[PDB]
Amino acid sequence: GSTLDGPYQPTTFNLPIDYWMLIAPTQIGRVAEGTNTTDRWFACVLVEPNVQNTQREYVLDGQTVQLQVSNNSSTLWKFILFIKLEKNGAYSQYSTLSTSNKLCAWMKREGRVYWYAGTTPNASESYYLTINNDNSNVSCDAEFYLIPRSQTELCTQYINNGL
Ligand SMILES: CC(=O)N[C@@H]1[C@@H](O)[C@H](O[C@@H]2O[C@H](CO)[C@H](O)[C@H](O[C@H]3O[C@H](CO)[C@H](O)[C@H](O)[C@H]3NC(C)=O)[C@H]2O[C@@H]2O[C@@H](C)[C@@H](O)[C@@H](O)[C@@H]2O)[C@@H](CO)O[C@H]1O
């Protein structure tokens, strides 16, 4: 079987640059969040298949917020990447990952957070937001693995095919 660095228990930490944090939730809802503390608060949420547009509640950046989610796939799970741009602002939707595998991943590099998006088995790191703060903390509600950038091909493989 595949051998990855992990699983690590859920925590809040200063994710080192140039590592994929491959997150492996078992529960729907909030999966992970991060912030540069200045103009980006980002969060991913997991939605099960066959969900008509609806408003659910999540605790993001400490606050209970109401966000519209949907997933019109009868079979694929959907991670949604939400971002707010100021401390007191509202979250907007920026990217999604539709997947049979229930894994998502992001990386801090080049002052950005890269994110796997698309539809498995063809998800790719096509999306990023800009944070310009290498010491940005990430909070994770799920177990996760760390994959160095040299093994990006393996991260892509796991996102798309599972472990
Ligand atoms: C459907 C589709 O193909 N859309 C493409 C856009 O996604 C592309 O826009 C850029 O996409 C990037 C991710 O792949 C990234 O999100 C980027 O914005 C981010 O990076 C810039 C600097 O490079 C800024 O710092 C932004 O603030 C940052 N976004 C966040 C939320 O932090 C996108 O670039 C922005 O959007 C594009 C369209 C231009 O208007 C830029 O001036 C913006 O900065 C892009 C293709 O690469 O166009 C679409 O086709």
Technique used by the depositors: X-ray
Exposure string for 22-49, b = 16+ CB within 10 A, e = fewer? bbbbeebebbbbbbbeebbbbbbbbbee
Q: Is the CB of 138 under 6 A from ligand 1?
A: no
CA of 120 to the centre of ligand 1 (A): 22
The CATH architecture to which 1-163 belongs is: Sandwich (2.60)
Sequence length of the chain is: 163
CB neighbours of 31 closer than 8 A, spacing ≥ 6? 23, 25, 44, 45, 46, 79, 104, 140, 141, 142
| Geometric angle at alpha carbon 83, from 16 and 104, rounded to 5° | 55
CA of 132 to the centre of ligand 1 (A): 15
Q: Is the CB of 128 under 6 A from ligand 1?
A: yes
CB neighbours of 10 closer than 8 A, spacing ≥ 6? 140, 141, 142, 143, 144
Specify the 3-state DSSP secondary structure of 132.
coil
Beta bridge partners of 120: none
Q: Judge contact between 99 and 120, C-beta under 8 A.
A: yes
CA of 75 to the centre of ligand 1 (A): 29
Torsion angle (degrees, nearest 10) of CA 132, 136, 142, 144: 70
Specify the 3-state DSSP secondary structure of 76.
coil
Give the resolution value in Å: 1.6
Torsion angle (degrees, nearest 10) of CA 7, 13, 16, 18: 60
